[PDB]
UniProtKB/Swiss-Prot annotation:
Residues 176-358 form the DCUN1 domain. Part of an E3 complex for neddylation composed of cullins, RBX1, UBE2M and CAND1. Interacts (via the DCUN1 domain) with the unneddylated cullins: interacts with CUL1, CUL2, CUL3, CUL4A, CUL4B and CUL5; these interactions promote the cullin neddylation and the identity of the cullin dictates the affinity of the interaction. Binds neddylated CUL1. Interacts (via the C-terminus 50 AA) directly with RBX1. Interacts (via DCUN1 domain) with the N-terminally acetylated form of UBE2M and UBE2F. Interacts preferentially with UBE2M-NEDD8 thioester (via N-terminus 1-26 AA) than with free UBE2M. The keyword Kinase does not apply. Part of an E3 ubiquitin ligase complex for neddylation. Promotes neddylation of cullin components of E3 cullin-RING ubiquitin ligase complexes. Acts by binding to cullin-RBX1 complexes in the cytoplasm and promoting their nuclear translocation, enhancing recruitment of E2-NEDD8 (UBE2M-NEDD8) thioester to the complex, and optimizing the orientation of proteins in the complex to allow efficient transfer of NEDD8 from the E2 to the cullin substrates. Involved in the release of inhibitory effets of CAND1 on cullin-RING ligase E3 complex assembly and activity. This is DCN1-like protein 1. The record marks C229 as: Essential for interaction with UBE2M. The DCUN1 domain, also known as PONY domain, mediates the interaction with different cullins. The DCUN1 domain mediates the interaction with the N-terminally acetylated NEDD8-conjugating E2s enzyme leading to the NEDD8 transfer from N-terminally acetylated NEDD8-conjugating E2s enzyme to different cullin C-terminal domain-RBX complexes; the neddylation efficiency correlates with the DCUN1D1-cullin and DCUN1D1-E2 interaction affinities. The UBA-like domain mediates interaction with autoubiquitylated ARIH2 leading to ubiquitin ligation to DCUN1D1. One of its GO terms (molecular function) is ubiquitin-like protein binding. Changing D351N: Loss of binding to CAND1 and CUL-RBX1 complex but retains binding to UBE2M. GO terms for biological process: positive regulation of protein neddylation; protein neddylation; regulation of protein neddylation; regulation of protein ubiquitination. Expressed in pancreas, kidney, placenta, brain and heart. Weakly or not expressed in liver, skeletal muscle and lung. Strongly overexpressed in thyroid tumors, bronchioloalveolar carcinomas, and malignant tissues of squamous cell carcinoma of the oral tongue. Not overexpressed in aggressive adrenocortical carcinomas. Mono- and poly-ubiquitinated by ARIH2 and ARIH1. Monoubiquitination by ARIH2 is mediated by an interaction between autoubiquitinated ARIH2 and the UBA-like domain. The monoubiquitinated form preferentially interacts with non-neddylated cullins and modulates cullin RING ligase (CRL) complex composition and activity.
Length: 360
């Protein structure tokens, strides 16, 4: 599995292609269906136990990973997955003849499609597949663009189609350059690894957003930003990838869709909990009260019916558990607080708040 065994290949390859099209995650995370995954869509286990997932990962990588891997380790897992996808293509009577006929770059494009939509999806493209086998590249490209595939992921699909049309990596070289040049507009001139405050302000100005708006925090959430103070190059590239954007105009068009996600099950809670770590000083375990108040006012205004009294109470540090539980309190509390359970192991801060707020 050593990547050195692949040094004779091009530096552009199927892993790099899928890193651009589907994204790379170096820490264990839950996918859509809630399953522990890592790398480029590598499912670790269906077990609810993170410890189980870590055991599988330590097993596959051959070291104590603690749930974090390097890009090279992710490529090793991915290459195993490619090998299995290829084996399947080669048993598929519809896909084998096409695959066999293609050059290496165009084979990568076909494998990309199989990763996205499975063999049955890809096999359904009967005319386009025949065109590819006959080297009718421009016709194949025209037909593929009329599909539901194209409508679902137009930017990815356009790159894959261009790869069929040309047999070159140009669409991926162009994407990388576009993202690099966009990133360079925002990067800290003294630290190329991040965008600092001046760059975040420029980013917000380019998106026509007030930095203090909830939209900006929603963006941070979608980019999984570690801290309000900076926006790393990795975060920027991973988020633009996951959102399928290569331009500010495309990102701007995506913001309303991010905002809509907050209505899906559990997503507001995920956003709310995200806010705590994002807002806090990294060197600290807890969140300074003044900063907690600022973010509570941003995210809970119009949701927490006692927010104004909460402010008054506090104006007379916050740990993660207390932050988290305020949302639960907000959700369960009656309009008159008459259903508060003092034995519910709420934070002392909330017990004290209820005692303060009832006389008001
Ligand atoms: C409740 C009132 C909060 C007020 N401030 C707190 C700092 C916020 N901040 C840093 C920042 C951005 C632009 C201009 C000046 C400072 C950030 O939000 N960073 C940030 C960091 C990373 C990303 Cl991806 C994004 Cl979108 C934003 C913006 C809102």
């Amino acid at each position: 599995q050593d990547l050195e065994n692949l040094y004779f290949q091009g530096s552009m390859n199927i892993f790099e292609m899928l890193r651009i099209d589907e994204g790379l995650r170096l820490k264990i995370y839950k996918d859509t269906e809630g399953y522990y995954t890592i790398g480029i869509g590598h499912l670790l286990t269906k077990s609810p136990s993170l410890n189980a997932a870590k055991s599988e990962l330590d097993k596959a990588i051959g070291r104590n990973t603690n749930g974090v891997i390097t890009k090279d380790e992710a490529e090793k897992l991915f290459n195993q997955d490619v090998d299995a996808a290829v084996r399947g293509i080669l048993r598929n009577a519809k896909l084998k003849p096409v695959y066999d006929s293609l050059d290496a770059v165009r084979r990568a494009a076909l494998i990309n499609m199989v990763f996205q939509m499975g063999e049955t999806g890809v096999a359904g493209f009967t005319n386009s597949l025949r065109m590819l086998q006959q080297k009718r590249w421009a016709e194949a490209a025209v037909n593929l663009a009329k599909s539901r595939w194209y409508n679902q992921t137009p930017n990815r699909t356009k790159r894959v189609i261009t790869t069929f049309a040309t047999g070159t990596w140009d669409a991926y070289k162009n994407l990388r350059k576009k993202l690099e040049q966009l990133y360079n507009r925002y990067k800290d001139p003294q630290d190329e690894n991040k965008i600092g405050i001046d760059g975040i302000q420029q980013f917000c100005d380019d998106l026509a957003l007030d930095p203090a708006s909830i939209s900006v925090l929603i963006i941070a959430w979608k980019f999984r930003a570690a801290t309000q103070c900076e926006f790393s190059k990795q975060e920027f590239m991973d988020g633009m990838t996951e959102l399928g954007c290569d331009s500010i105009e495309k990102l701007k068009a995506q913001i309303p869709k991010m905002e809509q996600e907050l209505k899906e099950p559990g997503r507001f809670k995920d956003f709310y909990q995200f806010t705590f770590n994002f807002a806090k000083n990294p060197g600290q375990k807890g969140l300074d009260l003044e900063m907690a108040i600022a973010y509570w006012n941003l995210v809970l205004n119009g949701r927490f019916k006692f927010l104004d009294l909460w402010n008054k109470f506090l104006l007379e540090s916050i740990p993660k558990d207390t932050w988290n539980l305020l949302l639960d309190f907000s959700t369960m509390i009656a309009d008159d607080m008459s259903n508060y359970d003092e034995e519910g192991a709420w934070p002392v801060l909330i017990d004290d708040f209820v005692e303060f707020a009832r006389p008001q």
